[PDB]
Structure 1
């Protein structure tokens, strides 16, 4: 997260870090045994870390649980980025409290101009690089489809939406992926991609969770 702020210890209790020996992607907890993330974040043998703040220091409210299974969406196309969503099942349920809590799926898609909360432990730097210890946060507006389409030369599909600021400066970044975009207390987005980070006329792009609510529920129920 570039141009953002330190969220505060456990203020975003649905934020989850996916760890493969090190932090590498975030997710969102949708219920006590299911985490939503990005399909491009798939890795075998993931450990999912709940109640994290400082990912480098053991602070007392962490829960480390192993991914039972990681279910990439069937039409995820690693090359085009379309359907960049995945569900991770945990081997055991997380124990839910004030610092570990699930986020609601949307009932309808969020409208352009909605202010949302984006968070993660990804790059915070303007130009050059730096990864924070504690969780970063960003409030950013969903931009319009016609604004997003003109903003890129990669092919945008109807399973993506863009959010952030056209002037650059404020954006999700590398290591944020798979993390949440929450709008009006609903999980509307998954950090998916962007052309660099916080660059002018290059806003962040997000999996449009609202198109996948049925697939999520059916998947959770079948497994």
Structure 2
């Protein structure tokens, strides 16, 4: 997260860290047994880490649970990142508490202008590299689809939306991928892609979760 702020320990209880010997992507807990992340974060040997703040220090509220199965969206296209969403099932149900909680799925899509909360352990520099140990936060508005498509001609599909600031300075970044974009208490987006980080006229691109609620619900119910 670039241009953001330190969230505060466990202030984003649904935020998860995907670990394969190191943190490589974020995710969102949707119930005690399932996590939603980006399809481009897919990999074998995933360990889901819940209740995390400083990902390099065991602070006392963590839960480390291995994934038993991963399900990448059937229509995911790695070249364009269309349908960049995946589900991860925990080998054992997480113990839900104030520091480890699920985030609700949307019942409808969010409108442009709605303010959302984006979070992650990604790079905090727009130019260069610096990875935080604690969770970073960023409040950003959903941008109009026209401003989104103008920034990325022929690259935006109905399954993506942009959020952030066209002036630059505030954006998600490498390492935040797969993480949550929560608006009005609903998981509306997944950190997916963009151009560089916090660059002018190049806002972040997010997977439009509201288009996948039926798939998520049916897939979890059958697995």
Both proteins in one fold, TM over 0.5: yes
User: Aligned residues, how many?
Assistant: 223
Cα separation, 2, equivalents of 1:144 and 1:197 = 19
Query: Secondary structure of 1:212's match?
Result: helix
Structure 1 counterpart of 2:34: 34
Aligned to 2:10: 10
Which residue in the other structure is 1:157 paired with?
157
Distance 2:220 2:105 in 1: 13
The answer as to whether partners of 2:119 and 2:137 remain within 8 angstroms in 1 is yes
Deviation for aligned residue 1:153: 3.7
Once the two structures are superposed, residues 13-57 of structure 1 have per-residue CA deviations (whole angstroms, 9 ceiling, x without a partner) of 000000000000000000000000000000011000000000000
TM-score normalized with structure 1 length:
0.99
Q: Matches of 1:145 and 1:171 in 2, distance apart?
A: 17
Query: Is contact 2:126–2:196 with CA below 8 Å preserved after alignment?
Result: no
Shift of residue 121, structure 1, vs aligned partner: 0.1
User: Structure 2 length normalisation: TM-score?
Assistant: 0.99
1:126 positional shift: 2.4
Q: How many Å apart are 1:154 and its aligned residue?
A: 5.6
Cα distance, 1:155 vs structure 2: 1.1
- Aligned with 2:210: secondary structure? helix
Structure 2 residue ranges without an equivalent (≥5)? none
1:170-205 Cα deviation digits (max 9, x unpaired): 000000000000000000000000101100000000
CA RMSD of aligned residues (A): 0.6
Runs (4+) of structure 1 exceeding 3 A deviation are none
Helix, strand or coil: the match of 1:40? helix
CA drift at 1:80: 1.1
